[PDB]
């Protein structure tokens, strides 16, 4: 998971993107999210941030089907601090998110659907 910050250069603050392995309750407080695999993404320094989701799972091949509650990581950003703003910027900016597999990513049993 890569995130590109699209906010006014002159602004700063700190964010924390976090992961939480299969099964665990969605970490609702920073303090919780802070415990799992996570990176502190400084807005000021680098606009982009890549946080790889390791392959932490039971079976050799993780089920790609619609299961009851398959697990299943948890990528989520948190207000480490609260956004610092320069003089008079619109104060509201966005971030975009990108996802991609890795060279160690595979698939089997060609299934389908079309209508």
């Amino acid at each position: 998971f890569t995130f590109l910050f699209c906010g006014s250069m002159m602004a700063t603050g700190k964010l924390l993107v976090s992961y939480a392995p299969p099964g665990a309750d969605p970490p609702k407080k920073r303090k919780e999210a802070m415990l799992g695999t996570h990176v502190i993404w400084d807005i000021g320094l680098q606009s982009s941030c890549t946080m790889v989701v390791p392959w932490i799972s039971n079976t050799t091949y993780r089920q790609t089907i619609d299961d009851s509650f398959t697990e299943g990581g948890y990528i989520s950003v948190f207000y480490q601090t609260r956004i610092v703003v320069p003089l008079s910027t619109p104060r509201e900016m966005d971030i975009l998110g990108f996802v991609s597999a890795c060279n160690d990513f595979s698939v089997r049993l060609l299934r389908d659907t079309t209508h």
Epitope: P26, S68, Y74
Partner: nanobody, 122 residues
Framework: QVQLQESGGGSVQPGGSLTLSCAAS????????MGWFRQAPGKENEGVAA????????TYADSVKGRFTISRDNAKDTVYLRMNSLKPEDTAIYYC???????????????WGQGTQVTVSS
């Protein structure tokens, strides 16, 4: 996948109340939680109430704190929005959605609804 219908929406009165509800599909509401967003006409989505299913602990927005209530029944597959002491601003396009949990945050909710309009000061 899951298509939960927003029920209980109607035009009431100032100082009044109104019960809202959303029935599950695709899954049993019990795993995902459920909440409500009142996107006031011409303004952004506005968080009001959220509650976790398999771990009941409610969260309210400060603009509606104390007056507004939210409850759940995982057995009837429905989520119960109790809006109390309703006022003229409380006239918005209400919405129910399912997320993780239980955290009024513009999103962090998956499947939404159709939009039920509660015109308090009718």
């Amino acid at each position: 996948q899951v298509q939960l219908q927003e029920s209980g929406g109607g035009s009431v009165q100032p100082g009044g109340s109104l019960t809202l509800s959303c029935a599950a599909s695709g899954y049993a509401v019990s795993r995902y939680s459920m909440g409500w967003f009142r996107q006031a006409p011409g303004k952004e989505n506005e968080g009001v109430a959220a509650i976790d299913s398999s771990g009941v602990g409610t969260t309210y927005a400060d603009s509606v704190k104390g007056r507004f209530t939210i409850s759940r029944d995982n057995a009837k597959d429905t989520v119960y929005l109790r809006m109390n002491s309703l006022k003229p601003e409380d006239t918005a396009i209400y919405y129910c959605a399912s997320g993780f949990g239980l955290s009024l945050s513009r999103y962090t909710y998956a499947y939404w609804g159709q939009g039920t309009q509660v015109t308090v000061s009718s």
